[PDB]
Design a protein around this ligand. Structure first.
Ligand SMILES: CC(C)C[C@H](N)CO
Length: 330
């Protein structure tokens, strides 16, 4: 089997991407944030505290003839941005882009934190990291990808995120028309439950490439590119007036600037992030200070190749027995 679904930015800055997902019978379509940095499929639901729902589409298990309570199971998750959600669990039929999994754990939110409530465009998350991070207790559950794997033509999914445009998530096949050149594959460590890999270095603009190992995660659920303070300082030093602002929470730059590109290494290959991808616009409406798309990972504890980096590439998440990651230009 295979699946193919379009993913769409939620706003003009590509803050996140939503992908329609069919849950239950008859189908209830919810727009989920596909997150390669977590492993829970959770949704706003008929069980969600009413005051915490504001515009989201909800899953109502009582209206699904295939929903079954997973008796005794609960879940609770906290994300890298400080947001959180929790609730109970149903199993139901879940389809993405024509690919169907039966008996998928669908985690129904009883509570969500304010940042979820305040974003009406995201109806929940679909986790695509390794199932060892799944939070369901007392019986840990599998991700949609892990459940689908055996049915897939090839045990892979691909992320092809757009810059200020829709893109695609494919399951079970590699679309050889979706990238240029060749795909360079690189080793993955699953020890922390993430798609964790080691970049071979970086360049700023037209500068020379610095060969240096940078361990990090391929994370579709993080907006920005978070790298070591040394790397990030070298980037922003090439932008007149750029500075790190503790009041704003990272590097800002004059909105009048033209940003340099940023290149990262994948083995002997190079992925170039155009400067425009690194512009996240005014810090507040009407401000001439703009927020940068490359930020320090110091204090996070891990480097994160988020959407800013991933959208510059066609990315293969290879879930074979020994997992690997592939990157191509596009
Ligand atoms: C591991 C985290 C820092 C990032 C994942 N997207 C979950 O928030």
């Amino acid at each position: 089997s295979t699946g193919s679904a379009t993913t769409t930015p939620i706003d003009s800055l590509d803050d996140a991407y939503i992908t329609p997902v069919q849950i239950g019978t008859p189908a209830q379509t919810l727009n989920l944030d596909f997150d390669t940095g977590s492993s829970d499929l959770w949704v706003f639901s008929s069980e969600t505290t009413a005051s915490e729902v504001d515009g989201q589409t909800i899953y109502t298990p009582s209206k699904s003839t295939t929903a079954k309570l997973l008796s005794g199971a609960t879940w609770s998750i906290s994300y890298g941005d400080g947001s959180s959600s929790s609730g109970d669990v149903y199993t139901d039929t879940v389809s993405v882009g024509g690919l169907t999994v039966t008996g998928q754990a669908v985690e129904s939110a009883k509570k969500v934190s304010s940042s979820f409530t305040e974003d009406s465009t995201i109806d929940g998350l679909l986790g695509l990291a390794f199932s060892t991070l799944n939070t369901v207790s007392p019986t840990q559950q599998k991700t949609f990808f892990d459940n689908a794997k055996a049915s897939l033509d090839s045990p892979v999914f691909t992320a092809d995120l757009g810059y200020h445009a829709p893109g695609t998530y494919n399951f079970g096949f590699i679309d050889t028309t979706a990238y240029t050149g060749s795909i360079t594959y690189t080793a993955v460590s699953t020890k922390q439950g993430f798609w964790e890999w080691t970049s071979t270095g970086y360049a700023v603009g037209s500068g020379t490439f610095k060969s240096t190992s940078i361990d990090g995660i391929a994370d579709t659920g993080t907006t920005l590119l978070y790298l070591p303070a040394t790397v990030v300082s070298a980037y922003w030093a090439q932008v007149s007036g750029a500075k790190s602002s503790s009041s704003v929470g990272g590097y800002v730059f004059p909105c009048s600037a033209t940003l340099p590109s940023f290149t990262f290494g994948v083995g002997s290959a190079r992925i170039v992030i155009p400067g425009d991808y690194i512009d996240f616009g005014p810090i507040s409406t009407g401000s001439s200070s703009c927020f940068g798309g490359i930020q320090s990972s110091a204090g996070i504890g891990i480097n994160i190749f988020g959407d800013v980096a991933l959208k510059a590439a066609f990315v293969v998440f290879n879930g074979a027995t020994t997992p690997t990651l592939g990157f191509a230009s596009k």
